[PDB]
């Protein structure tokens, strides 16, 4: 009201300098950015073979929540924890004259790619989590087949890092359980089943199913409205 004034402002071509807007759509990203974006794009436009593409079919967040929840209990040894263990047995064992077995059998998550393979190969593994990233995808592509053929149940789970946390590495690639405290055997059988249902059961049909071949939306719409009009007037 006072001696204050409503002016508006005509931003309509040929007048008023354009205001500052959000151009985040338009910014000229560094090459390294443009690469990793378009790589993900190129990797979709191409029809991708069924032995890739059987990834992307990842776990769902809930079942995996339950599965990290388990695998957590069986983490490997901490630096200290084993120092502590050693300074137990070393002192103890060597004197009290226990047969290097004043230490309790350890139940832990098995890890490292080569380790877990021999485990699957030996039908000793009992539920294998496989990562969904893993950039030379080859390290891992043969694992669904393996677990299938060794009758080992498995799951493709989101996060090589998230696997890495439960083992104290940055990244892991795979995590597996072979052992289990009987107090958890029950949880796992239930866990196993869901997983088998989502993967190792569905495997054979997934092996028939190619991937990608997906248009981007500027040209999705292009034909969702070309094919909308042409056929049905």
């Amino acid at each position: 009201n006072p001696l204050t004034h409503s002016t508006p402002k005509n931003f309509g071509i040929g007048q008023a300098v354009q205001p500052k807007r959000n151009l985040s759509r338009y910014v000229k990203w560094p090459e390294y950015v443009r690469v990793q974006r378009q790589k993900k794009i190129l990797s979709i436009r191409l029809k991708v073979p069924p032995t890739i593409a059987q990834f992307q079919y990842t776990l769902d967040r809930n079942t995996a929540a339950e599965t990290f929840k388990l695998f957590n209990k069986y983490r490997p040894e901490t630096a200290a924890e084993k120092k502590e263990r050693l300074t137990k047995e070393a002192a103890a064992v060597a004197e009290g004259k226990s047969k290097q077995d004043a230490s309790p059998k350890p139940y832990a998550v098995k890890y490292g790619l080569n380790h877990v393979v021999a485990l699957i190969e030996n039908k000793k593994a009992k539920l294998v989590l496989i990562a969904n990233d893993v950039d030379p995808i080859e390290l891992v592509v043969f694992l669904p087949a393996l677990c299938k053929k060794m009758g080992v149940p498995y799951a493709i789970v989101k996060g090589k890092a998230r696997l890495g946390t439960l083992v104290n590495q940055k990244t892991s690639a795979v995590a597996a359980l072979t052992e289990v405290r009987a107090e958890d055997e029950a949880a796992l059988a239930k866990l196993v089943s869901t997983i088998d249902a989502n993967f190792a059961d569905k495997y054979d049909e997934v092996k028939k199913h190619w991937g990608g071949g997906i248009l981007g939306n500027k040209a999705q719409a292009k034909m969702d409205k070309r094919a909308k009009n042409s056929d049905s007037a």
Partner: protein, 121 residues
């Protein structure tokens, strides 16, 4: 939530932390001592018969003066080596590739007097 809001179309190199050097072994064990001190700056008197004239009549002291040394430095090392005050210092490179200061003393001083205090004559 969601994304940034860049109003500029240009993407620029993030202004990231420039750490300063805090070494681990030294550069040279012992720093160099002063490479142009007052004694090295002003090398000899110039007692050419025609130079001496400039001292009796000029209130001007004439020195062979290190080529490495500028007027500022000639002025200081004279003022300092000799207690005297300096008015202005003209300079020149001789044909034998040695530098010559024409040093004019302020009226408070007599150069001709000061010339044969340093000793030459």
């Amino acid at each position: 939530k969601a994304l940034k809001v860049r109003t500029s179309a240009t993407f620029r190199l993030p202004k990231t932390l420039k750490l300063a050097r805090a070494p681990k072994y030294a550069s040279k064990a012992v720093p160099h001592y002063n490479r142009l001190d007052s004694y090295k700056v002003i090398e000899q008197p110039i007692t050419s018969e025609t130079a001496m004239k400039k001292v009796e009549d000029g209130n001007i002291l004439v020195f062979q003066v290190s080529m490495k040394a500028n007027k500022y430095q000639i002025k200081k090392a004279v003022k300092e080596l000799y207690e005297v005050d300096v008015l202005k210092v003209n300079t020149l490179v001789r044909p034998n590739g040695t530098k010559k200061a024409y040093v004019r003393l302020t009226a408070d001083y007599d150069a001709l007097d000061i010339a044969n205090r340093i000793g030459y004559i």
